[PDB]
Amino acid sequence: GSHMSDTTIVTVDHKDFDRTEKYLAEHFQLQNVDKADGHLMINAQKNYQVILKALSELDIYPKYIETRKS
């Protein structure tokens, strides 16, 4: 069976948060949403290219992206 022990955390500028949340809601599963600090958590991704390219199409560039144990 599965071992879903890791999360990917995307951090964006406040002005980009709502549109980043919309993108991740439509294409991934949001586990946590912290608008106050600019963080969005999804299931752990091994390859960031899909997300980075789609955010770039929205003119959004994360301040940070990290995968770690939840």
Added chain:
Amino acid sequence: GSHMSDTTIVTVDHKDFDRTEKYLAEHFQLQNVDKADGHLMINAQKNYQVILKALSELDIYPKYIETRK
């Protein structure tokens, strides 16, 4: 003396390795590479925006980016 304390590692598709290496080494300090697995190691960056926007202008979208000691 000084030493390297921390590194930002940018990982790209093999086809993007040379152009990424040129961009990063021109605008940041290159510390090391791993060409076999498409990694470029630069002095650590607190905010990835500038690099991710500049790479997108070159039509480069990293497979991975991380910072480590």
